[PDB]
């Protein structure tokens, strides 16, 4: 529980941080780097993006509990967004909502 | 071996990325965020910074092998730099050398 959640939290936080402090002119280039080089796909999150939860198997819900405690109670953790499989974790910068998608 | 190394690689890569694409005016502020919020201390690496290897115990050398395969053959991995304990991993942006220090 704790260990997996800690790693996922670290990834989301470092990714959000990279975006937060990014040179606005290089922000699109940064998103390409994160995806290709770090395997981290960032997307804007639209209010109408649909999602499906990870199953209640193994320690998923405990992992999810620990992630929200560290990232924020309103964090969405999902196994798909708009029918696209992955490990999906939402985050925010100010008024802007985002997804991070990782490979399962 | 693989798993620990993969996580450390991810941290170093995301950290380097954040720095690489950072707004130059916010770069010092970014370093504060990484340290306080992500527990990642970045330092410039000076050619005369001394270091001490992690012991050859457990799977340390295998972890180190996997880290270098992903980050670069010239990567230094150390248990201390200038007598300061931690998990230290070097990285570069162009001509500039850096350390990342994590808690053990
Ligand atoms: Ba909290
Ligand atoms: Ba919003
Ligand atoms: Ba809002
Ligand atoms: Ba809202
Ligand atoms: Ba919004
Ligand atoms: Ba290589
Ligand atoms: Ba140099
Ligand atoms: Ba050099
Ligand atoms: Ba050199
Ligand atoms: Ba140098
Ligand atoms: Cl953008
Ligand atoms: Cl979905
Ligand atoms: Cl600087
Ligand atoms: Cl040392």
Automatic annotation (TrEMBL), chains A, B:
It is found in: Cell inner membrane. This is histidine kinase. The chain holds residues 47 to 150 of 452 of the full protein.
């Amino acid at each position: 529980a704790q260990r997996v959640a800690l790693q996922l939290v670290a990834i989301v936080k470092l990714t959000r941080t990279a975006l937060l402090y990014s040179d606005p002119d290089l922000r699109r280039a940064l998103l390409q780097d994160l995806e290709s080089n770090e395997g981290v796909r960032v997307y804007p999150r639209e209010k109408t993006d649909k999602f499906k939860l990870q199953p209640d198997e193994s320690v998923n819900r405990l992992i999810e509990h620990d992630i929200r405690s560290r990232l924020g109670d309103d964090t969405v953790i999902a196994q798909s967004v708009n029918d696209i499989p992955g490990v999906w974790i939402s985050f925010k910068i100010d008024d802007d909502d985002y997804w991070v998608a990782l490979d399962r």
